[PDB]
Symmetry: D2
């Protein structure tokens, strides 16, 4: 079985191991210390995303400016969706599993300024629970999130990009079929999953101001983008 490799079995081998936050649990929580730790963890996960993306079949065949562009547009999609997946696998409670040593449960979301950020991220794990997403579906979906936005005037390797995206869409279809439902159910599930991918644009739009804000505060001490939607 594994002796006949598919695209998704390749995506499974290139998925990196979870990073630990390094958060000291022996000291009282504060929003300050959590957010500082998440900023450093966020930077490390961006590094992991670059290495991951370069291993995706097809990605390194795009023009180098295209690769940089897709990673710049999509990194928050990848991060929020992967966070959703870790939270979904951790528990059926309403929590965010940023790292195995930094889990934000309902208690920690009572800390000042935490909940209004976390509610947009909890939407992702809630959708994953509702749809009972499998690991192979998730892997295909996460690759597609890398391919979710392009410049309004197009990529340099636009024709190749279109072939790559269409292929990972097909791969998501095969992952769905593996759930052994019937054709009518597979058809509807494709809608459900790709609707979730579409809604990630809104998740990210709502999270970007908070990323901006924490940069201004803790680091600085202070239209041209086309969304590739599955459903209009």
């Amino acid at each position: 079985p594994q002796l006949t490799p598919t695209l998704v079995s390749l995506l499974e081998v290139i998925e990196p191991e979870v990073l630990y936050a390094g958060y000291d649990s022996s000291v009282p929580d504060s929003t300050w210390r959590i957010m500082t730790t998440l900023n450093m963890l966020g930077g490390r996960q961006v590094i992991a995303a670059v290495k991951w993306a370069k291993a995706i079949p097809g990605f390194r065949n795009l023009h180098l400016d295209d690769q940089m562009t897709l990673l710049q547009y999509s990194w928050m999609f990848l991060m929020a969706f992967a966070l959703g997946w870790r939270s979904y696998r951790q528990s059926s409670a309403n929590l965010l599993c940023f790292a195995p040593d930094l889990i934000i449960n309902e208690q920690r979301m009572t800390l000042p300024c935490m909940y209004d950020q976390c509610k947009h991220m909890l939407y992702v794990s809630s959708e994953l629970h509702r749809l009972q997403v499998s690991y192979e579906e998730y892997l295909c979906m996460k690759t597609l999130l890398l391919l979710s936005s392009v410049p309004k005037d197009g990529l340099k390797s636009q024709e190749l990009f279109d072939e790559i995206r269409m292929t990972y869409i097909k791969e998501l279809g095969k992952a769905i079929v593996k759930r052994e439902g019937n054709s009518s159910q597979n058809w509807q599930r494709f809608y459900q999953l790709t609707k979730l991918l579409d809604s990630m644009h809104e998740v990210v739009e709502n999270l970007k101001p908070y990323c901006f804000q924490t940069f201004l505060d803790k680091t600085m001490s202070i239209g041209n983008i086309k969304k590739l939607l599955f459903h209009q």
Copy 2:
């Protein structure tokens, strides 16, 4: 000799090894790719600074909010000063040695938008050449840059901070005396070195807008601080 440890011999053992940028030299340069690489390298160096600071004698005895505060205020001071040191040790040319595999020489500073950033960082290496700073002087100076700003209303462990800073000032004095000049020359050199530390406030003020700008562009795809000056 090394069998009698001093504070500076401790600072020498906790100094981390240089990070590599991972920059592909087989592909033409562009400002885009350099800046993207420097942003990722910058985040990794912040991680290194946190680990370093926690090993500095005295630092972990400050209140945890004070530690976070000092690292938040000073990280750009540490980064620009260490960059100055690596550039100063690399060559007497006007270059910035961000990493052994990413050196910005006069040629690469002709790339668009590069020089106006780099001129503020070249000031640091030029001052190091002018003063022929030793490694032990540098190590003491870099610790002092961690201690270069505090909140207007003070730190939680203000009294302990004052003792720590005064001790690393004394340690810089001992490093100066090791150059085996006479007392009149040692006195003047203390002024020269601490004047350079003072001027780092202006270096950082000039670099922060460019950090802000690259965050807005490549990441987002878009008064309460007292300076501790040596000379008024």
Copy 3:
């Protein structure tokens, strides 16, 4: 093309990056210092081999005892073969243990260096003579993991046999990409699998030196069936 994955393209993505030896070039060379450095580089390469093997499609499906057994038998096969490849790609007749630790002609004169390095240079020269491609090499290295089993067999013998047969077929596919006719592809499979068979002799000549370095520099002092392609 990469959008249609093959076993060999999976083998290409799990191939680990080359390790550096950490050898100080600014100090006079010494047989003592090279061998100590290689002992520590060797231990790190074992670690890399365990992680690589666990990602080989099919390998994790074998019984855990089988996994451990195949890694114990084959680690020196894997290391010498990969060394041959690195040396062939880096070129002349030089052993390229790491980018910062190359046994050049001068270092060969050091005592006991040549008598060890001669068996390893054989691997590098055969790879050069046969003009082995990267995809052939990756299939061959996987086969070396599967080159020896216990006399009594493995606990997952039936699965092992399927796994090994599949990577044999995968080496055939890599051979066919060299664009020869079928008669030449058949003959090239012989040439490549002869080299694989000859690794048993290479290894048997290298194990004593490994043993003596362990006794010297670390302690300061039968039931295995070879799976040969050609009898």
Copy 4:
């Protein structure tokens, strides 16, 4: 207080963080699997010891051959002593090889486990009996690096002798911090250095098992002066 650095506070900053074994707890234990895991953990701990030693004030000033010689003689001393410490701090009579690989009472029953672990548990129980402090432990571990030299001497013998005498004095300073009177401090120095001397016996009992595991699981098959504190 840290603002006045001592040799022992430098030893505290260069002490490496504990390594994890990577041992899968969700699978049935096996003597085979524990020993293979410990073999790879051992190799990684050697790497940590080399980096640690190069940062010991004075060590890099010895001749490079001396450095290599002291590390070859002493690595098992360092590993067993640090294991004793980790086990003493972590609890009962348990060997704490890594946070994820503890030899509990059940794992002791596995074949050949106890006969090895008994010599290592001796180290842990002595540390407990003597209530060794962390600063005493760090000085003692450094002395173990300096516990054996070649019969003919070292190339930097005079410097070595100064280095060793300085860490002997540093263990004395750590003893004095326990706030006993001078007569008790004198006697505690005897007790601690007796334990150091007894590591030679511990190691000599552990080397054979290291040898046999190497022959079994890796190959699949005099001129040294002990520097004793008490004759």
